[PDB]
């Protein structure tokens, strides 16, 4: 599993893989690792799938109730606080959850909070979580800039996921892309890892150690 | 089922708690009891009335040992006094002796009894106790003491006092015979003289109850071996009362 999210002048880029494993046998390669909490907020998936799905859907319900009560869109800090307080109430029970909550508000701008099942809640710029986080983070560090255009940022996210999926056995399948702006999140599609590898090798000249 | 969660004792528009006054009236309709404080002891006395001539009056005692050094007497309603004595003994054990290893002083035990009696005038669905209590005791750091506790939970320290039907006359008699130098025998004699006025029937050892807080009684201590181990409280038998008469 590899998930990543970063902020830039254009907003937020979120990129995930789609492989799930149960040991050596690949249970699925079509897993959706981005939770669509609401048309303005996104949440990544890592650790336990059921915990992430259930509690981020519950978080969407809570954000809706907050917007009904206060007649304003909830803050990303407030939603991440709600999720972190809830998971802290369960500390020690056995929940497994490491997620990135990504949003874009008028007052805050683009904002990413990493929330863990241990109660951790960190505001950040670049996050990479999973067994393949090292390669993807190396790519992002080598190529991150604040003034990246939307196309360059999407390509960078895809390239980082591809680099992680090539080396990490428990990572791969396909790449799901998402762009988060002020008006909401835009889905930029699913890209098969196998075809993407050959296309990238041809266009860049990389992976010379692999016979094509 | 029990929906009586509201106070049955409330303030009248004049500012008087009617139920407590009625309990005081019930006390004032009770038989006479007295207490006299001496320099080396305290005497507590009461009249023993029999409901029936066929009843064994010895089976009913109006004077009760609270602690080995503290006893009590009452005027008013008997069963209320019996329950209150049970509660007072239990509070003495569970509030002081199980914490400090010693019996409580007279004043603190009186305060606990007063707290119990006050709670019956503000808690929901409860009638106030219809008794007045005279408590006589001795403690190491305060000496001998005598206290009076009312149905409202008010308590006062007395050199000598009386409660019951003949309260006013006995109080006047005791006022006329106080000199701050009496001994235990003088106090017992004065108590007997004051009781002889307020008793209409036969006045002997079978119609009077007397108790004293005096000196330690190693005979009323069924073991030997500990030098620091005395039950000052002592109840006089009918034979001793007859002899003193």
């Amino acid at each position: 599993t590899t998930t990543l999210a970063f902020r830039f002048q254009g907003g937020i880029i979120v990129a995930v893989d789609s492989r799930a494993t149960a040991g050596n046998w690949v249970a699925s390669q079509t897993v959706k690792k981005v939770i669509e909490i609401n048309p303005f907020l996104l949440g990544t998936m890592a650790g336990g799938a059921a915990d992430c799905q259930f509690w981020e859907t519950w978080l969407g319900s809570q954000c809706r109730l907050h917007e009904l009560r206060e007649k304003e869109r909830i803050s990303v800090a407030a939603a991440s606080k709600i999720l972190s307080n809830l998971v802290y109430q369960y500390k020690g029970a056995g929940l497994s959850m490491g997620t990135m909550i990504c949003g874009y508000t008028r007052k805050e701008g683009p904002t990413i909070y990493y929330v863990d099942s241990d109660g951790t809640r960190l505001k950040g710029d670049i996050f990479c979580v999973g067994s393949g986080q090292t390669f993807a983070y190396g790519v992002l560090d080598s190529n991150y800039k604040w003034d990246l255009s939307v196309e360059d940022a999407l390509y960078l996210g895809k390239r980082s996921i591809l680099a992680a999926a090539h080396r990490d056995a428990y990572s791969g399948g396909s790449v799901n892309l998402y762009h988060v702006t002020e008006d909401g999140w835009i889905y930029h599609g699913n890209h098969d890892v196998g075809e993407l590898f050959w296309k990238v090798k041809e266009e860049e000249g990389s992976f010379n150690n692999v016979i094509g | 089922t029990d929906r009586y969660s509201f106070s049955l004792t409330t303030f009248s528009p004049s500012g008087k708690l009617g139920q407590i006054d009625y309990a005081l009236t019930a006390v004032k309709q009770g038989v006479t009891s007295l207490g006299i404080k001496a320099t080396n002891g305290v005497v507590i006395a009461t009249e023993k009335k029999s409901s029936s001539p066929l009843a064994m009056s010895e089976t009913l005692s109006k004077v009760s040992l609270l602690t080995p050094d503290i006893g009590a007497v009452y005027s008013g309603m008997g069963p209320d006094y019996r329950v209150l004595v049970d509660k007072s003994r239990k509070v003495a054990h569970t509030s002081y002796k199980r914490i400090y290893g010693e019996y409580p002083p007279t004043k603190l035990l009186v305060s606990e009894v007063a707290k119990i009696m006050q709670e019956a005038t503000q808690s929901g669905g409860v009638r106030p106790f219809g008794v007045s209590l005279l408590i006589a005791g001795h403690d190491e750091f305060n000496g001998f003491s005598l206290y009076q506790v009312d149905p409202s939970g008010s308590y006062f320290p007395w050199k000598a006092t009386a409660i019951g039907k003949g309260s006013v006359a006995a109080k006047t008699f005791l006022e006329k015979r106080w000199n701050d130098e009496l001994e235990l025998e003088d106090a017992i004699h004065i108590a007997l003289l004051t009781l002889k006025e307020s008793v209409e029937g036969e006045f002997n050892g079978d119609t009077i109850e007397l108790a004293i807080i005096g000196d330690e009684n190693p005979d009323l201590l069924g073991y030997t071996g500990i030098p620091t181990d005395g039950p000052r409280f002592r109840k006089l038998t009918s034979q001793e009362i007859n002899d003193r008469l």
């Binding site: - | 509201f6 303030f11 106080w178």
Partner: protein
């Protein structure tokens, strides 16, 4: 059991609480208590209501080493509230390792009193308190609290049978630069003038002072013995 309920916590058509007013009327028939605060101490003086029996060993109580109270009303309810206040002061000392300010304790007691007025079906406490204390915030402080749950701060105050006459007397002959001895004299004079008895003897009085020094440290609380009360009465001029 709905018939027997007296509804002790309801308003009147005029917006009044009947039980609170009746408790105030009950208090208006109790022994007078007076508190006077000078520039260097506090004086509490209460009048007993008497016989020729034991007095040295009912109206003056100690809360902690720096706060004392004078009671007007039912004695047993007052003892309940005093035990609660002592526990509260000890809890504050345990938590913060400092002595509790007077106002915090007074406000806690007032809240306890107000609770009986608003919720539940129990009668209110028929007790009025005069608090005398010292703290590092304001120095010497004098407060009063009634069954309504309201508490007030006073330079000089009286509670009890003759509050009107005592307050009228205290409005005059009081100055902001008085001393502890002048306050003692004023309290004794007011008690003598408002007393409905032949003479103001030592066996119908309770006295207490809070000041600095007197074989102690920062603040000393003195509860006068009957002999000390007699000596003070002789010195002031009452001689009764």
């Amino acid at each position: 059991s709905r018939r027997y309920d007296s509804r002790t916590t309801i308003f009147s058509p005029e917006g009044r609480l009947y039980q609170v007013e009746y408790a105030l009327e009950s208090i208006s028939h109790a022994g007078t208590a007076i508190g006077i605060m000078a520039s260097d101490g506090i004086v509490l003086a209460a009048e007993r209501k008497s016989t020729l029996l034991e007095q040295d060993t009912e109206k003056l109580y100690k809360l902690n080493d720096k706060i004392a109270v004078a009671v007007a009303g039912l004695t047993a309810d007052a003892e309940i509230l005093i035990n609660t206040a002592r526990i509260h002061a000890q809890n504050y000392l345990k938590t913060y390792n400092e002595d509790i300010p007077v106002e915090i304790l007074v406000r806690r007691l007032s809240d306890i009193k107000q609770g009986y007025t608003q919720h539940g079906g129990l009668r209110p406490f028929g007790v009025s308190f005069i608090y005398a204390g010292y703290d590092d915030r304001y120095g010497y402080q004098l407060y009063t609290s009634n069954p309504s749950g309201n508490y007030t701060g006073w330079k000089a105050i009286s509670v009890g049978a003759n509050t009107s006459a005592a307050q009228t007397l205290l409005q005059m002959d009081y100055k902001d630069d008085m001393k502890v001895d002048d306050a003692i004299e004023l309290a004794l004079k007011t008690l003598s003038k408002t007393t409905d008895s032949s003479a103001l003897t030592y066996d119908r009085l309770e006295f207490a002072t809070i000041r600095k020094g007197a074989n102690d440290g920062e603040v000393y609380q003195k509860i006068f013995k009957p002999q000390e009360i007699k000596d003070i009465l002789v010195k002031t001029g009452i001689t009764k």
